[PDB]
Amino acid sequence: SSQIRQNYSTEVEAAVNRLVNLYLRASYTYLSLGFYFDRDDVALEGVCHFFRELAEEKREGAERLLKMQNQRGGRALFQDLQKPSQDEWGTTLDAMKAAIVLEKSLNQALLDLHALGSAQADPHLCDFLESHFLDEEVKLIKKMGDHLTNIQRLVGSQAGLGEYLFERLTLK
Amino acid sequence: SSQIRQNYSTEVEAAVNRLVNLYLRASYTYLSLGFYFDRDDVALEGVCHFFRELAEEKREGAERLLKMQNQRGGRALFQDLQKPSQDEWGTTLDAMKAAIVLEKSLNQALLDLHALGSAQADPHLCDFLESHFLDEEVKLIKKMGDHLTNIQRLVGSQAGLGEYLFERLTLK
Amino acid sequence: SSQIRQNYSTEVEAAVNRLVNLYLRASYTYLSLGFYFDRDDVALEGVCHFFRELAEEKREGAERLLKMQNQRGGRALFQDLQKPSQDEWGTTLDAMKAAIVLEKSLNQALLDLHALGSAQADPHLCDFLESHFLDEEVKLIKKMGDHLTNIQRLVGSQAGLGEYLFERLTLK
Amino acid sequence: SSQIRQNYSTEVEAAVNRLVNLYLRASYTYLSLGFYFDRDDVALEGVCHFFRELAEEKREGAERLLKMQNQRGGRALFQDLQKPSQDEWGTTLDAMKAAIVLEKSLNQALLDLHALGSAQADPHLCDFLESHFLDEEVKLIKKMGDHLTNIQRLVGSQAGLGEYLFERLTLK
Numbered sequence: 169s170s171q172i173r174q175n176y177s178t179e180v181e182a183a184v185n186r187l188v189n190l191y192l193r194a195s196y197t198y199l200s201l202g203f204y205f206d207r208d209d210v211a212l213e214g215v216c217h218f219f220r221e222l223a224e225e226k227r228e229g230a231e232r233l234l235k236m237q238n239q240r241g242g243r244a245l246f247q248d249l250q251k252p253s254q255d256e257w258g259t260t261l262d263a264m265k266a267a268i269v270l271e272k273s274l275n276q277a278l279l280d281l282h283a284l285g286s287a288q289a290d291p292h293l294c295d296f297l298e299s300h301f302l303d304e305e306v307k308l309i310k311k312m313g314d315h316l317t318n319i320q321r322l323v324g325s326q327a328g329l330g331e332y333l334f335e336r337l338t339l340k
Numbered sequence: 341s342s343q344i345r346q347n348y349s350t351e352v353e354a355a356v357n358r359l360v361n362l363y364l365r366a367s368y369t370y371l372s373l374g375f376y377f378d379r380d381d382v383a384l385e386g387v388c389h390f391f392r393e394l395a396e397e398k399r400e401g402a403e404r405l406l407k408m409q410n411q412r413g414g415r416a417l418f419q420d421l422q423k424p425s426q427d428e429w430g431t432t433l434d435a436m437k438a439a440i441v442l443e444k445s446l447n448q449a450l451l452d453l454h455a456l457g458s459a460q461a462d463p464h465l466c467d468f469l470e471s472h473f474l475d476e477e478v479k480l481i482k483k484m485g486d487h488l489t490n491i492q493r494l495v496g497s498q499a500g501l502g503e504y505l506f507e508r509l510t511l512k
Numbered sequence: 513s514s515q516i517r518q519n520y521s522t523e524v525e526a527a528v529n530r531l532v533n534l535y536l537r538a539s540y541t542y543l544s545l546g547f548y549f550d551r552d553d554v555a556l557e558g559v560c561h562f563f564r565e566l567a568e569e570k571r572e573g574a575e576r577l578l579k580m581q582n583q584r585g586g587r588a589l590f591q592d593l594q595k596p597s598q599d600e601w602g603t604t605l606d607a608m609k610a611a612i613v614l615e616k617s618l619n620q621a622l623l624d625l626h627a628l629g630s631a632q633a634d635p636h637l638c639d640f641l642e643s644h645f646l647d648e649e650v651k652l653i654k655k656m657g658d659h660l661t662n663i664q665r666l667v668g669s670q671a672g673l674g675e676y677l678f679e680r681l682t683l684k
Numbered sequence: 685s686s687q688i689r690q691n692y693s694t695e696v697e698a699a700v701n702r703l704v705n706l707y708l709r710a711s712y713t714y715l716s717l718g719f720y721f722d723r724d725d726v727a728l729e730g731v732c733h734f735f736r737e738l739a740e741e742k743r744e745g746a747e748r749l750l751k752m753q754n755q756r757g758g759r760a761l762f763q764d765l766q767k768p769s770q771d772e773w774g775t776t777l778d779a780m781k782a783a784i785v786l787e788k789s790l791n792q793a794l795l796d797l798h799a800l801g802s803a804q805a806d807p808h809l810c811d812f813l814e815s816h817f818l819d820e821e822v823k824l825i826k827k828m829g830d831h832l833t834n835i836q837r838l839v840g841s842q843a844g845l846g847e848y849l850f851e852r853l854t855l856k
């Protein structure tokens with residue numbers, strides 16, 4: 169094992185590789201979401217942009233994890249990336265529900281890794297997560313929940329009209 | 341025939357003159373569309389501007405074709421320009437449907453000319469079309485289809501209100 | 513099928529989805545290559561940067577293909593992304609050999625799609641590829657071949673020293 | 685004891701004083717390393733600069749610890765500073781090996797203090813270390829390991845030549 173490795177368990181090393189896979193899968197899911205909203209028969213540009221920027225954020229999260237893996241002397245191992253869960257994503261409301269489920273699953277994976285780090289007495293890992301992921305995730309989930317509430321208020325009213333207005337006046 | 345003409349069939353020469361006529365007719369149709377939306381009893385300024393800019397684009401397309409005709413040593417021949425197909429164009433939805441039909445007909449004329457060029461082994465013609473028309477047309481048809489979808493989503497809801505909102509928040 | 517679709521075969525539509533998968537797989541392979549060269553026991557920063565920028569180029573290629581799919585009225589379909597072919601990539605010479613093999617395979621997929629487009633008389637597709645992919649790929653393959661020749665000249669001489677010098681004076 | 689002291693154990697107070705001594709000793713060791721590489725019979729300016737900047741970083745670390753000691757109401761206590769472990773430091777490779785051993789020993793002292801803080805439920809201490817030391821140390825150890833790998837690749841080849849090239853093209 170590495171000349172630099174110190175206080176870095178094989179358990180954390182493996183869980184970091186699994187989290188990289190989760191973040192790349194999330195990136196891929198957002199890519200599919202973004203391009204679905206660019207379809208000529210969907211055509212919500214603000215929604216497409218919201219999801220495409222999240223695809224970039226999640227890829228950046230994976231990259232940060234891979235950089236940290238190398239800084240600690242662990243070894244990146246990549247696995248197949250499963251396709252997204254759907255090929256068509258419904259309405260903006262359906263899509264945002266799927267996105268908040270996905271973010272909560274990433275958040276739970278972060279909390280599980282933090283707990284592992286704490287059991288392993290790995291404070292560099294705990295600080296890394298705290299500093300670069302946990303607050304980011306909380307803020308994003310809050311934003312999504314705000315969006316869900318606004319979308320729901322709009323599309324209870326008159327669904328197409330509300331979906332257009334949300335895109336135009338919140339997202340764009 | 342011209343001192344400069346080389347590899348330029350009479351078949352392409354004539355088809356180019358016909359395409360000039362199609363593009364000027366399209367320009368004329370957009371002029372009528374634009375001024376219909378400026379009527380005091382229609383009064384959708386963003387829609388009028390959308391169509392008036394397309395009238396200018398189609399005239400510019402004709403001019404490019406005429407410049408190319410002369411560059412190749414062909415001879416521009418003009419024919420009567422038929423009036424547009426309607427004197428009143430209905431709702432924004434009706435108008436955008438008529439505009440996408442018109443653009444698909446121009447696109448099909450471009451593809452037919454390209455095929456002729458390819459049968460005649462005229463790569464200058466093929467490159468000209470590829471470079472200055474085919475991608476332009478695809479992008480425009482995609483934009484129109486996006487607009488149709490947004491208009492349809494709005495005017496299913498409450499038709500006058502949706503038509504105003506589309507004009508104000510997408511077109512203007 | 514789409515209100516905008518015109519002259520866009522189901523054969524091209526499917527082959528475009530397959531090419532998106534090839535380009536994302538290539539991106540993933542470059543991500544693994546880049547992070548391998550960032551290992552503390554490999555530690556060739558210029559090499560890591562070369563491959564990480566190629567990961568971004570290939571992702572951008574996929575995105576362009578997906579944008580074009582939607583512009584034509586086709587439907588993006590994503591499949592699982594297979595992991596890269598290796599977990600460790602050897603020397604810079606080994607890595608660059610693997611990268612040129614990968615780029616030739618992408619190039620062959622582009623040429624095959626172009627041939628399909630030509631058989632389908634789809635000049636928008638042919639122009640898209642010509643304009644945004646084929647020359648890009650030729651230039652990249654030439655650059656890689658230049659690199660291979662320089663690496664081989666260096667590491668025939670005294671292998672570690674040559675690998676350092678290439679990184680420092682060509683890549684960095 | 686101090687009018688400001690709150691939740692600050694005598695165990696942490698003493699361990700902080702010991703860590704100040706470790707950091708000043710490390711500073712002193714880097715001063716000796718730096719000036720060894722400035723000898724006319726060693727004469728590797730980039731290496732001298734690398735170590736002299738580390739002498740400044742370690743002194744700055746001690747100063748931060750002393751500032752924190754006073755902020756918490758503890759009392760700085762200084763002890764004799766032991767001389768560095770060697771008077772001559774060999775090759776760049778020997779020196780960098782000695783530097784990574786030294787940094788791992790500082791890192792282990794940081795982890796031990798963090799564990800003490802955690803046993804004492806002293807989150808201000810834990811955050812201080814996390815924020816100002818633990819990531820700094822990981823990044824430095826990674827850099828040193830990168831350097832070791834490059835030095836080893838060079839001096840396996842032809843030792844004097846490799847040592848010059850590393851100094852010139854990585855350090856300087």
Ligand SMILES: [Au+]
Nearest residue numbers: 286290291294
């Ligand atoms: Au921890």
Ligand SMILES: [Au+]
Nearest residue numbers: 458462463466
């Ligand atoms: Au041709």
Ligand SMILES: [Au+]
Nearest residue numbers: 630634635638
């Ligand atoms: Au073609």
Ligand SMILES: [Au+]
Nearest residue numbers: 802806807810
């Ligand atoms: Au603590």
Ligand SMILES: [Cl-]
Nearest residue numbers: 176177178179
């Ligand atoms: Cl372990």
Ligand SMILES: [Cl-]
Nearest residue numbers: 250251252592
């Ligand atoms: Cl799956």
Ligand SMILES: [Cl-]
Nearest residue numbers: 348349350351
């Ligand atoms: Cl002829």
Ligand SMILES: [Cl-]
Nearest residue numbers: 421422423424
């Ligand atoms: Cl008529």
Ligand SMILES: [Cl-]
Nearest residue numbers: 520521522523
């Ligand atoms: Cl078909």
Ligand SMILES: [Cl-]
Nearest residue numbers: 248594595596
């Ligand atoms: Cl596989």
Ligand SMILES: [Cl-]
Nearest residue numbers: 692693694695
């Ligand atoms: Cl105490």
Ligand SMILES: [Cl-]
Nearest residue numbers: 765766767768
């Ligand atoms: Cl001593």
